[PDB]
Amino acid sequence: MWVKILSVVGARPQFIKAAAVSRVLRASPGVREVLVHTGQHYDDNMSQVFFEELEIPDPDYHLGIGGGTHGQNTGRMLEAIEGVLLKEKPDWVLVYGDTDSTLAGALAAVKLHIPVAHVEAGLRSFNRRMPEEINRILTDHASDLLFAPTETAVQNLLREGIPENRIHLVGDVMYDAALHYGAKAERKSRILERLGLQAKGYVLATIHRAENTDDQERLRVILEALAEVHQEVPVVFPVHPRTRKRAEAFGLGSYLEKVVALEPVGYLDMVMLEKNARLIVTDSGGVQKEAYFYRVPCVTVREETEWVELLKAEWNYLAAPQNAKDLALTILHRMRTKGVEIDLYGDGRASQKISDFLRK
Amino acid sequence: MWVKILSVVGARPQFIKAAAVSRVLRASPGVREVLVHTGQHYDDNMSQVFFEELEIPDPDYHLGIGGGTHGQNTGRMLEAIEGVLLKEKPDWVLVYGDTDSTLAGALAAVKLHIPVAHVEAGLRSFNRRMPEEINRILTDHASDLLFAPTETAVQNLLREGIPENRIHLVGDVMYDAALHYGAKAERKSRILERLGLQAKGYVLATIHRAENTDDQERLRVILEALAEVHQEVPVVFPVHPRTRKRAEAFGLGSYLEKVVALEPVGYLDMVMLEKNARLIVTDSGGVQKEAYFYRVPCVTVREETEWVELLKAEWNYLAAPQNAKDLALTILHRMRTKGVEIDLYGDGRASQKISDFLRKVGIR
Ligand SMILES: [Cl-]
Ligand SMILES: [Cl-]
Ligand SMILES: [Cl-]
Ligand SMILES: [Cl-]
């Protein structure tokens, strides 16, 4: 009708962010939306339940690309995305996060003189070996509008010579989504019932990174710690399939009967879990932020984390799997902590502010 | 034991820079060179001549890509190059200048953790609507090693957050190439013989650009002026084929009979003309640089140039083609001027520097 805003997405978090943006857009008449998924129409990365439960729109296009090298995936995505852009001639192109899809969308649009906005801009790990570091840098420098989630992000962009007037501090739209899904789980998740658990009466653990799941001592130290912690507090562990088959491969599948081990759980139930736990123990970077979003203290069993500002506001604590005694104690300590009451990633209406800056 | 150095080239200037680099590398031990052309293997005699005359190495690969959109060309180049990198496993990829080929080469390499060097880094037009400005920005950011041609390019790179330890001021490789092709012309070219001219005894003119060629007022001005200059000093005018069409159709064909008008000349003959000219008149960016390289005063018949530094150093001069008598006058004035004796684009050893670094042998 009056403005076309086309979203490119090719990973689950990008769909989640695009849907949070789209909740705001869909309430203004005369925004027409187009959703372009770079991947396979019925990719098994995702499920009926991911779409229904997390309220993800049906893409208008599926480009069918993935499973290649960075060159094959990115090259094909650049051609195919360009084609859709030429066909749809949208006013705005929104790209999200820092995958190959992000970069394809931006490079496709900028050569066509179609304005590109990068949702989640300015994040730097300062290690160009990560494909995602290259993706975010190049997306940032190709985009017209840079929607940063933090002040560090903003400063990262300025230090790189991007003009201030292309940079907008809007917060992290994954916080908005955490709140939306948070409310929804309270309304619908029953996983507390079926497990027979009490809000603020359990510890939740996820472990699925290499640095911990491969090495055998580490996975001892980790599961030996969770074992001992189960004694004081019910520990709930939804085990990445891959982390299960690594433990059954040092026979360690005995340190998993003391804890309520579970087979990976529905997305809403997992939110329920996260937001009602007294502590979350993990090596996932995503769960570290979800912890902060729901104001549940976090221990990070990793020897390194990426979200240093959660550490600095004492919502997250670094505890490297050395031995079980040392680790179970620091788990127990942190379980009775909290962090500073500061908003780190916006106020939960990043979507609003993005939308306002566009429909301008 | 060797270093393997793979060049990605897609336009003529890149081939020329690459071949500049390859002339230095061939004298060195334990170097393997791979040349990847992203375009087509051409059989014709024209292209054969370019490779022969300008001493361009025979590419190892021709990926056969071009002729589509930005996304098509770039995305296909990205995949085909990566395919080549996955087979050859070079220690370095060199990319050159600012075409889609440049950018595809860099993006291919960085995601495979193959170090990339951008020959000709840091140039900025500050206009992101230009596709080539996007290419150089993202290339420079994708790159491990930035071979900048000028101090201005260095500051451009520093201002965008790029660490000093990745930036090397080495000069313009095309300067090294101009010197080599200049020597070759002096050796081989008989064009001055044939035209019965003498060094410093003519003016060379080349008009290429649409804005001049496709406009009666502007081409009238230029041809009227060259014909007037030709009275004082012979004017040699290799006329673009398109340029001639327009002239005849506009009814200015007679003014071409009034200067030494030629059909387009060989690459080396053209080098010879430029370097032995008393003055050059042009609207070509390349030619303006070559005038400076050969230390011949230049006049740019255009409302602006890329190369402001040549204006500042008084090697080049803007004379917009508004008035035939004015452009004549300007030409005859500038023809006995020179610029400041200073290097702007290196000392003609940019190649050596580049080579020295990639071989981990240190820059001199
Ligand atoms: Cl992402
Ligand atoms: Cl094109
Ligand atoms: Cl080039
Ligand atoms: Cl790298």
Residue numbers in the entry:
A (entry chain A): 1 to 360
B (entry chain B): 1 to 364
Sentences from the paper on this structure:
The first structure determined in this investigation was that of the apoenzyme crystallized at pH 9.0 (structure 1). The crystals of the protein belonged to the P21 space group with two subunits in the asymmetric unit. The model was refined at 2.3 Å resolution with an overall R-factor of 20.1%. The two subunits superimpose with an RMSD of 0.6 Å. Each subunit adopts a bilobal architecture with domain 1 defined by Met 1 to Val 170 and domain 2 formed by Gly 171 to Gly 346. The architecture of domain 1 is dominated by a seven-stranded parallel β-sheet flanked on either side by a total of six α-helices. Domain 2 contains a six-stranded parallel β-sheet surrounded by nine α-helices. The final α-helix, formed by Ala 350 to Lys 360, extends from domain 2 back to domain 1. The total buried surface area for the dimer is ∼2850 Å2. The subunit:subunit interface is primarily formed by three α-helices defined by His 70 to Glu 88, Thr 99 to Lys 111, and Pro 131 to Ala 142 in subunit A running antiparallel to the same α-helices in subunit B. As shown in Figure 4B, the interface is fairly hydrophobic in nature with Leu 78, Leu 103, Leu 107, Val 110, and Leu 138 projecting inward.
